[PDB]
């Protein structure tokens, strides 16, 4: 019956012209950004841990800003006198109340005081040292309350914006890298079955010096959640690449394996066993014929001026007796 | 069983690149010579008959030799003594014995004397009637015992040496014409069922003037008897043209439409049913594939990724349930 489980080899159907190619790859190396204090000073909070994924902006470390915070106020303070003094002197020597040797002076200081008040700016606002861009915390270098120097390594944040994967292409199969609108799917080989979209980003071509074809590609999958799928450097992969060697064809072709096709007893029809979920349901195909009905080339088994039967084969047996009708 | 007789569908295995093209054409009509004595008589004998076929040199008719026979054998005693006395005066005249008039004179009478012999002799032999090639007396123009004159018509004789049939080839099947070792084979509509090979006399070949091919081509056949045979001018036939339009094809191919083959639940083989005798027989044969396993393009039905059946497509039901082995 239906619930008798029959083996059966199977095939995928394919588009006649649709080129397709597997290859292995490998997830590209990130180079490690150490980041950095411009100001020295001691640690007082460290609120990110190794693993951390963290956005471009966010806090990574802060120094204690007591005596940043004194040099500034100071610097305000000694620009903002600077500043009133020069406005007064303009107002005075635009009627010549002082002398231009008195006004220099005041504009040479308010320069120095601006310089001063500038770099003070700076001090504070590198208090707080950022990410400078979407990473993850490879490495704390340092600890809490710990003292540090300008340019003293605070974490190794590896850059996650893009996951990059390299392959070689054969050199003979520059032609489907080539081809119009060549699509890249990425299967890991540490979670199979679950396909994600790629896209190009470079190829070397020089076909002439015969050494492969390296390819860069990157993930370009909205479910591609990094969250879930923990993919590193050096993780393997496979590399489907789709190629439409012939778009223009108007009508297209599928392919199927003849041993695929069978007739039926009541009619002319051919039919293929469609798989879906486990089970078989019989689908009506049309051949494709150039003119008139479907014809096959054979190689061995007939002579020419032999009779074979086309209509009727499956309603006979071995030495059964015919009618040959119109 | 094998007795149940079942109406089939059938044909003929076809080699790839043998075309083959039917025409219909006609019998040549053949010029009725004419027969007639070159000597005037009364016939004696005239012993043929309308309808029967002869040979070159046969007898037709013959006339009372009587007069001539007179005539001859005096014209035959005439030449004898005209002769011996030339040659007497050539071994007078040799020794000056006899004048050069006389000399002339015996050579002029010795010609007079030869050319009544000639004529008489030819006379001789005209009064035997021969046919002057293998043919059939289509008319009987005359009666034994009647008198004619020359040129009188005894007979109407067509040459049978010959079985000409003429028709014409569309402009466009000129390559098949032009095809190395062509054949032709004849099907007269008075004799269906029988074949005759036939050879190439002639065809106008001004592809040009877009008026078709005029063909002629004879009978050569042993099998061609036109005693059981009878084949007439105006009577008409099927003409089949058989031309390989590829004979450097290494591994000859042959078409059988793809209805014709089906396979076995027990293996991966193709098959035909081979019809002998209105009989079939189950013959195995290797459907061309150039790599691998024979593939179909299918045309409708079918969508890319679909799952389909390539191997126990026979031992399965609507709905089953299975199991992809490989």
């Given at each position: ?247 223009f064809i108007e009508e297209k072709l599928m392919n199927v394996p003849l041993s695929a096709v069978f007739g039926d007893s009541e009619n002319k029809n051919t039919y293929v066993w469609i798989v879906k979920d486990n089970k078989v349901n019989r689908r009506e195909v049309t ?40």
């Amino acid at each position: 019956d239906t619930a008798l489980v029959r083996p059966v080899k199977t095939a995928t159907v394919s588009s006649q012209s649709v080129i397709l190619k597997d290859f292995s790859g490998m997830v590209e190396a990130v180079e490690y950004v150490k980041l950095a204090f411009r100001v020295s000073g001691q640690i007082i909070n460290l609120p990110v841990v190794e693993g951390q994924r963290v956005k471009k902006g966010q806090l990574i470390a802060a120094i204690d800003p007591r005596d940043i915070s004194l040099q500034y106020a100071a610097d305000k303070a000694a620009y903002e006198t600077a500043a009133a003094q020069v406005e007064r002197n303009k107002r005075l020597l635009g009627r010549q109340a002082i002398s231009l040797q008195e006004y220099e002076i005041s504009v040479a200081n308010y320069q120095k005081a601006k310089s001063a008040y500038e770099l003070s700016t700076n001090n504070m606002r590198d208090t707080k040292l950022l990410a400078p861009f979407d990473g993850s915390i490879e490495t704390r270098l340092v600890e809490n309350y710990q003292r540090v120097n300008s340019g003293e390594g605070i974490v190794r944040l590896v850059n996650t914006r893009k996951l990059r994967i390299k392959f070689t292409v054969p050199d003979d199969y520059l032609y489907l890298l080539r081809a119009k609108d060549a699509t890249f799917k990425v299967e890991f080989d540490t979670y199979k079955g679950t396909v994600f979209n790629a896209r190009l980003e470079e190829y070397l071509d020089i076909s002439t010096d015969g050494t492969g074809i390296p390819v860069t590609i990157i993930i370009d999958d909205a479910a591609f959640d990094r969250t879930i799928y923990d993919v590193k450097p050096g993780f393997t992969c496979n590399i489907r690449l789709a190629s439409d060697i012939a778009p223009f064809i108007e009508e297209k072709l599928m392919n199927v394996p003849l041993s695929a096709v069978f007739g039926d007893s009541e009619n002319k029809n051919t039919y293929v066993w469609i798989v879906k979920d486990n089970k078989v349901n019989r689908r009506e195909v049309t051949v494709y014929s150039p003119t008139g009905e479907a014809n096959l080339l054979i190689s061995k088994g007939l002579k020419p001026g032999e009779t074979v039967v086309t209509a009727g084969v499956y309603q006979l047996v071995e030495g059964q007796r015919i009618k040959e009708v119109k």
